[PDB]
Structures are given as structure tokens and as C-alpha cells.
């Protein structure tokens, strides 16, 4: 009783059934290390200008 | 020190919107104008200097400073009329700029309250400066003159900009008040060896310092005469107002770091007044007494004294309207013969008998006749020298018996004998030649009645 697949049906993605649980570290892969802390507020102005020498403003 | 630098700086547009027979009587004019004005910093009336802004501010120190050089932008400008009359109008129109660009810097120079600003200022007047000496001198010698000036300046200003940037990358300012309140001992290491020479020597250099000085005799020769004039009168007092301002941080190291100085001052200072007895050239001789007057302002600055301050302060103003004298009246007889060879023109007496009368009171003020203020100050400097050590008076007192010799020996010379009566082109004294020898000396008696105006900071 053998029926022969056709052209195009083996190369298809298939899903099956599996009792067996998803790895969940398969890489093994480390801790990322935690980004910087950010900083936050609002803007105000640079604290009596630029202060760049002599320069008032 | 905006309504003084706002109008001179109108100065300018004045200068070039002007017609060409107004422009002179025009700026002359304002500059006196501006001159009154600056007399409004004399207004103080308790012992809190005079803090405009951040940026500006006035002490007994600065305000007599400022004050001379907005005097002396007149008088400057009297003084080069009849050398430029030849020259077509926009060539007097930029010689007026640049006397102008001058009195701008200075007057911000010594009213800078930072000390990279006081750099930044006292480094652009070098352009203008330049520029006058070989732009309207007379003699091919004028640009050797430029490139000895300029580089002999900008050799010992790059050390003091280091220095000046390393002081606030410690100190995180370059203020000056900040920095008289947070001063601390410095260690007496060879590393603040290195940086009390770094803050000193351009300083010294323009004073100049006896050794350094060989660019002084150079552009004065050279110079015209308002390059003459700003050269001996207010640009060679920015290295002792500098000096005065930055020794405050440099303390305790400036008690043996100023040996070397004080000798080379008070030895100098004769090497350079014996020199004027052998010297050909009027110019010259002049020159070399200013060397050895600032050699004074050198010592007393260098000893640090309530006394020494005060009496630097009157010598730089004294010398400097009686130096500014000096050459107006050499330049008024080269005007005539065009030579600066002071035994050339004799007897000038029998000629020009009220300007000989200039001469010998710009003679007595140098040779510090009392009570003018030329003496006080050289009277104060000597008082506080023989405290550091009674030795000093033995060099005080041969410069004293020098400074006489060479200054009647220049009055005898040219002034005196027998009329030299081949020059037949001795035209009589003009009214603006005659009003610029009073408008010296007149202030000079002025200032000698009341002396309490240019004391300084420490009386
Ligand atoms: C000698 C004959 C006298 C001739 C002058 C007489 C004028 C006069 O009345 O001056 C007297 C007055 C003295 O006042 P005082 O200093 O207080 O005396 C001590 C205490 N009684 O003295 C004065 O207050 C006048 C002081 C002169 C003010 C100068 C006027 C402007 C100068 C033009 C700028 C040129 C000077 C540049 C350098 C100035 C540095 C500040």
C-alpha cells in the first residue's frame, strides 16, 4: 500500500510531537553582563554657561 | 569698562567715515573725550576695588595704568601728524587704526580679572606693534627690529601660557581674586622652580631684564615716534603689572628665586646708565635709560615690600610720561635735520629757546629731581632695597651719579655751545610741538601734587 510522495511533499517543513522538553540554555551561554545605569531627568541648561576661561556666557 | 571700551572702540568707524580733513582733529578730539572719562575710575571712596563684572574690574594698580594709556592715544596721535602728512589718506586712516587697536588692548589688559585672558590681550598688542615699527619706519633696519621684538616676546609668552594651563588644570580657575583668597605654600620643588621661571621670564623679558633687553634699543632706533612713545610708556609696564599680579601665587619660592634678578637688575642697571655717557644715537641713549629704570621696577618688585610695591608703582607712571617726553623732543629735532646722532645738532638753545626750557624739565624729571614724582618713586624703591640689604645703597648710589652725568651731558650737548649754523632748515617750534611737551608735563606736575593717585595697591 505504498504510495510514492509526490514532487515538492518530502522537502516540506513538518512539525511533530515530542515528549521530550525544550532545552532552555542550549548555547550554555553565561549571564549578560548588566548595561549601565541610565541616566535620567529633564534638561536644564549647562550651570553658568560654558564655562570655557574667561568667557561669560 | 564698557563705557570706556564702547567709545573707543567707535573710534574706529570714526576714523574710516571721516573725511579726510576732518579725520584728525576728529579722532584727537574724541580721544581726549575718552580720556576724561576714564578719570571716572579715580572715583574710590573706600578700599573694595572696583569689580565690573566678571570679566572687568579696576584697582589702584590698574586704573592708573588705564588711565595713562587712554592719555597717551592723543597725544600720540599729535605727535605723528606732520611724519604722515605725506602719506595718502587711507595709509593715515590705518596708522590711526592701529594706534587706536592699541589703546583698546591695553585698556582691556589691564582691566582683565583672568590671567588667559590678560595673555590673550597681552599677546595681540604685539600685532599692532609689529606692524607700526615696520610699516613707518624710517631705516631698512626696522624689520630686524620687528623679528628681535616679536620673538624675543613670544619666546618666554609660551612657557608663561604653559604655566598659566597648568595652574588651572590644578586649580580650576585662572581668576585672579579666587586666586589671591585660595593661595597655598608652594613646596620648594625643582619641578615649581621650573614653573616660577615659567611664570616669570616674559615678564621679565618685557620689562626687559638686564641680559634680555638687546630688542629694546632695537625697536626704539627703529620705531616711529607713537611706536616710540607706547613702546617706553605702557607696553614695557605690562611685564611689571604682570609681574605684580602673579607673584601673589608664587610664594615662598620668589625668596631665593629672585636672586638671580636682583643681581642682574642692580647691576644691570648701571651697565645700561654707563652706556648712555658713550652713546652716538639720542634715541638710543634714551632707550638705555629706560632699561635702566625699569631695572628699579624690577628689584622692587622682586623684594616684595609695602615700600618696594609703592614705589615701582609712581616709577612705572613717572617713567612713562617722562620717557614719552623724551622722545617727543628727539623726534621734534629729527623732524628737522633727520638725523638721530645726538652731537650733529648744537646750541639749540639760541634757537629754540621754550623748547630747550621742555627739554631741561624732561631732563630734571629724569635725573629724579625732587620733589616730582619721579624721585619719590626711585626714593621708595632705594629705601626698601637698603632694608633687604644695606649694600644695595653702593649700586643705588653710583646709578644716581650716572643718571645725573648722562642726563646734563644730553642737554649740554644738544641744547648748549655754539649754534651749529650750517643748518639753515631749523624752522621755529610749532604750536602742536610745543603743546605736546606741555601735555607731558603738565600731568607729570599734576601727579607731583597729589601722589596719593598712582601709590598702588600696597599704601
Ligand atoms: C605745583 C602747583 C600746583 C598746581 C596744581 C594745583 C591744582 C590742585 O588744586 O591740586 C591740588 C590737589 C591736591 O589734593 P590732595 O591729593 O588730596 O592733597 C593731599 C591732601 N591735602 O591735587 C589734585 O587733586 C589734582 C590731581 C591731578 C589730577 C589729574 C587730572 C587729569 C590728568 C590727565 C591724565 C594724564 C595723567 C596720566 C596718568 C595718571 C595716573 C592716575
Redesign the pocket.
Known amino acids: 500500500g505504498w504510495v510514492r510522495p509526490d514532487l515538492g511533499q518530502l522537502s516540506k517543513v513538518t512539525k511533530v510531537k515530542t515528549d521530550r522538553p525544550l532545552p532552555e540554555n542550549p548555547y550554555h551561554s553565561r549571564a549578560r553582563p548588566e548595561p549601565n545605569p541610565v541616566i535620567e531627568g529633564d534638561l536644564k541648561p549647562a550651570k553658568h554657561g560654558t564655562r570655557f576661561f574667561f568667557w561669560t556666557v | 569698562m564698557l563705557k570706556i571700551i564702547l567709545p573707543s572702540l567707535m573710534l574706529l568707524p570714526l576714523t574710516w567715515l571721516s573725511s579726510p580733513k576732518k579725520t584728525w582733529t576728529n579722532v584727537t578730539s574724541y580721544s581726549f573725550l575718552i580720556?576724561l572719562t576714564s578719570?571716572t575710575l579715580?572715583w574710590q571712596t573706600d578700599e573694595n576695588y572696583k569689580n565690573f563684572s566678571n570679566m572687568f574690574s579696576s584697582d589702584p594698580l590698574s586704573?592708573?595704568?588705564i588711565?595713562?594709556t587712554?592719555?597717551l592715544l592723543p597725544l600720540m596721535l599729535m605727535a605723528s601728524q606732520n611724519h604722515l602728512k605725506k602719506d595718502n589718506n587711507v595709509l593715515q586712516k590705518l596708522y590711526i587704526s592701529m594706534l587706536i587697536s592699541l589703546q583698546i588692548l591695553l585698556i582691556m589688559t589691564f582691566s582683565a580679572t583672568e590671567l588667559i585672558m590678560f595673555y590673550i590681550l597681552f599677546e595681540a598688542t604685539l600685532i599692532p606693534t609689529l606692524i607700526i615699527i615696520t610699516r613707518w619706519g624710517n631705516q631698512t633696519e626696522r624689520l630686524n627690529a620687528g623679528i628681535y621684538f616679536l620673538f624675543y616676546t613670544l619666546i618666554g609668552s609660551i612657557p608663561l601660557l604653559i604655566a598659566l594651563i597648568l595652574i588651572q588644570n590644578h586649580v580650576g580657575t585662572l581668576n585672579l581674586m579666587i586666586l589671591s583668597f585660595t593661595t597655598h605654600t608652594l613646596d620648594a620643588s625643582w619641578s615649581n622652580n621650573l614653573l616660577w621661571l615659567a611664570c616669570m621670564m616674559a615678564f621679565l623679558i618685557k620689562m626687559p631684564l638686564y641680559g634680555v633687553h638687546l630688542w629694546l634699543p632695537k625697536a626704539h632706533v627703529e620705531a616711529p615716534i607713537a611706536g616710540s612713545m607706547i613702546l617706553a610708556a605702557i607696553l614695557l609696564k605690562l611685564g611689571s603689572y604682570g609681574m605684580i599680579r602673579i607673584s601673589i601665587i608664587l610664594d615662598p619660592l620668589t625668596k631665593y628665586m629672585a636672586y638671580p634678578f636682583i643681581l642682574l637688575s642692580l647691576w644691570g642697571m648701571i651697565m645700561t646708565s654707563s652706556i648712555c655717557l658713550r652713546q652716538t644715537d639720542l634715541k638710543s641713549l634714551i632707550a638705555y635709560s629706560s632699561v635702566s629704570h625699569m631695572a628699579l621696577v624690577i628689584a622692587s618688585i622682586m623684594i616684595q615690600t609695602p615700600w618696594s610695591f609703592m614705589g615701582a608703582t609712581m616709577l612705572m607712571?613717572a617713567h612713562?610720561?617722562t620717557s614719552s617726553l623724551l622722545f617727543c623732543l628727539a623726534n621734534s629735532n629729527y623732524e628737522r635735520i633727520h638725523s638721530r646722532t645726538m652731537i650733529m645738532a648744537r646750541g639749540l638753545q639760541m634757537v629754540f629757546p621754550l623748547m630747550a626750557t621742555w627739554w631741561l624739565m624732561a631732563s630734571l624729571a629724569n635725573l629724579a629731581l625732587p620733589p616730582s614724582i619721579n624721585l619719590m618713586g626711585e626714593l621708595f624703591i632705594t629705601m626698601s632695597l637698603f632694608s633687604w640689604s644695606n649694600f644695595t645703597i653702593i649700586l643705588m648710589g653710583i646709578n644716581i651719579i650716572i643718571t645725573g652725568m648722562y642726563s646734563m651731558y644730553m642737554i649740554i650737548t644738544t641744547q648748549r655751545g655754539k649754534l651749529t649754523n650750517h643748518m639753515i632748515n631749523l624752522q621755529p617750534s610749532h604750536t602742536r610741538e610745543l603743546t605736546l611737551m606741555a601735555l607731558h608735563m603738565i600731568?607729570l606736575?599734576?601727579?607731583?601734587?597729589?601722589?596719593?593717585?598712582?601709590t598702588g595697591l600696597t599704601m
Open positions: 580720556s578719570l579715580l586704573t592708573p595704568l588711565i595713562l587712554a592719555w607712571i612713562g610720561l600731568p606736575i599734576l601727579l607731583t601734587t597729589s601722589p596719593k593717585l598712582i
